[PDB]
Write a protein that binds this ligand. Sequence first.
Ligand SMILES: OCc1ccc(Oc2ccccc2)cc1
Ligand SMILES: [Yb+3]
Ligand SMILES: [Yb+3]
Ligand SMILES: [Zn+2]
Length: 607
Amino acid sequence: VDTCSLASPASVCRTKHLHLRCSVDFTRRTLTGTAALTVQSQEDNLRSLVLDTKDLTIEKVVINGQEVKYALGERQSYKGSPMEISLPIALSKNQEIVIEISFETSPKSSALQWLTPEQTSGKEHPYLFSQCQAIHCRAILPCQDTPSVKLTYTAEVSVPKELVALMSAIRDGETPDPEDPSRKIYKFIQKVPIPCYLIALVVGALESRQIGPRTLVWSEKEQVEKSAYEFSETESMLKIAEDLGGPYVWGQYDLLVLPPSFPYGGMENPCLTFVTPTLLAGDKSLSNVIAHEISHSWTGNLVTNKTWDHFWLNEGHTVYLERHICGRLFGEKFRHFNALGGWGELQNSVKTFGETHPFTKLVVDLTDIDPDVAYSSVPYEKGFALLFYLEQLLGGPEIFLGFLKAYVEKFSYKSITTDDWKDFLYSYFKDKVDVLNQVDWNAWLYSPGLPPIKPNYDMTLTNACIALSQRWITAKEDDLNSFNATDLKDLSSHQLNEFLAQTLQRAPLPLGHIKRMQEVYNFNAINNSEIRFRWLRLCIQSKWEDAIPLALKMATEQGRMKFTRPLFKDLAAFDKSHDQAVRTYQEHKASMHPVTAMLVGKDLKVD
Ligand SMILES: OCc1ccc(Oc2ccccc2)cc1
Ligand SMILES: [Yb+3]
Ligand SMILES: [Yb+3]
Ligand SMILES: [Zn+2]
C-alpha cells in the first residue's frame, strides 16, 4: 500500500512500458502529446484501472484504435486527481494492453520549471527542466505514480530546432520534425526498468563536452569549461562505484548542469544526472555530490524503495556508498571526517523539527503528508548512521561492503521495504544474528529523535575545526586581537566548512566576534556555496545588518533549497531583515521553481 498514489496498485496491474510522443510549447508553457502505456493485468476479469494525474488536461483515451470512457475524480490536494479508465474488454491475469492517452500539462505543473531567456546564461533562448521525485511525474503524464512499479520507456520529443532535448535515457538520434520544419525531434530509449520518478526532461540551448569514456557534461555554453574541470573525477568515481556495487548497467553516465533555480544538489536521473551550478566551486571540493549521484545507479535506481515511507533505503545506502567512494579516493580519515560531519547535520535536523517530530523517524508515515514537506537530511543521515553503526558492529568496512554488494545483487530491478532489507541483513549475517539482536530495531527504525547509539568516529581531521570554533566561542573581547589569517593556513575547504558548521551550532555569537572574523578571515570573498551559506547564516543569526544584502542575494540568485530555505528563514527571524525577506519572496515567487516557491511560502508563513 502506497499512501501517496491514487493509481491502481501493483497487485491490480503493472505498467511495463511507456512510449511518449510529445511537443514542448514555450509560448503556452505546455507539454502536449500522447503517453502510450503497456499495462499488464495482475488480476482476473480486470475491467477498469486508475492512474495518477495532477493538473493535466485529458483530450482522449484510445485502446485498440477506439476512444474509451474515462473519468477524472475530485482533486485530492498535493496527490492530484485520479483518472479511472474503462477498459473495452475484460483482461485475464498477465494479459497486456496498450492505452494511449492524449494529454497536455498545465503551465503551473509542479514537475516543471519554464524559464524565460532572461532567466538563462545565454539570454537568447528559453529553458525547461523537470524534477519528478517524489510524486511529480503525475504532473507531466498520466501514470501509476509509485516507485513500486518499474517500466522501460521510449520517447520522441519535438522542440524548436535551435534547442536541444535530453532525457533520463540513451540518446537515439535527432531529425527535423516531419510535421514542422521549424522544429526537431529528439529520440530516447530507456531499456532498463525504472520507477516513473526517474523520468526526466530538459530542453534548452545546451552544449556538451566529453570528460570521460562514458561521460558528457551538458550545460549552456557559458558553463561548459568550468563544468568539465569541476567534474573531472567522475570516471574514477564510476570505476570505484562499479567495484563496490557491481556492474554499471546504464550504458552512459552523463551530467547536466542546470540553471541556478534547480531545487536540489543533484538528481540521479538514469544516464543523465542533474546537478546544481552551486557545485561550481572551481576546485572540485563539492564532488561528493557527484559520488552520491553515481552511487544511486545501484542504491535507488536498481534497488528502489517500494513506497516513500521507505525513502531512507535509497538515501542511507547511497550516502554510505558515496562516503566509501570519497574514502577510496582520499583516505579512510576523510571518510570518517565526512561521516562525523553527517552526524552534525543530523543533530541540526532533529533540533529543527524537534526530537519527538514524526519526520525524524527513519521509516515515516506519509499518509496525508506531502513528501516535499517531509523532505530533510533525516533519511540521508539517520540512514547513514544506522549502516555505519552496523558496519562497526559486524566487523568493519570490508565485511559490510560484502553485504552491500550482495544486497544490490539480491534486489536489482526490484522495489523493496525496510522489512525486505532487514530480512536480507539477517540472512546475510546469519552467523552474527546474536550481534544483530543487540540492535534496538524499534528505536532506530520507528522512534523520533537522535539514534539510540552514536557510531565511533576517527577525529583526526575534525580536531582542528573543533579547536578553532572553541577558541572563537570562548573568546572574550580582549582575545579578539589574537585571531589572524594564519589560523586558516592548514585548513582545507572542507575543514573551513566544518569550522563554520561547528560555530553555527552555537550561533548567535557576539556581533563584535563576527565583525572580527570578517576582518581577519575575509569570509565575504569566499564563493564556495557551502562555506558562503554557513558564513551568511552565522552573520544573520548574529544580527549583522551588513550581511542582509549578501544573504538576500544568495537566497535569490540561486534556488537550491538546502541554501534558499534556511537563508529566507534566517532573514525572516532577524527583525532588521524580516520585511525585506517577505517582500523579496513576494517579488520573486512567480519566477521561482514551483516546489521551492511553495516551501519558502510555508516557511515564511506567506500564503
Ligand atoms: O523519510 C522521510 C522522507 C522524506 C522525503 C520523502 O520524499 C521525497 C523524496 C525526494 C524528494 C522529495 C520528497 C520521503 C520520505
Ligand atoms: Yb538506435
Ligand atoms: Yb580576558
Ligand atoms: Zn540521494
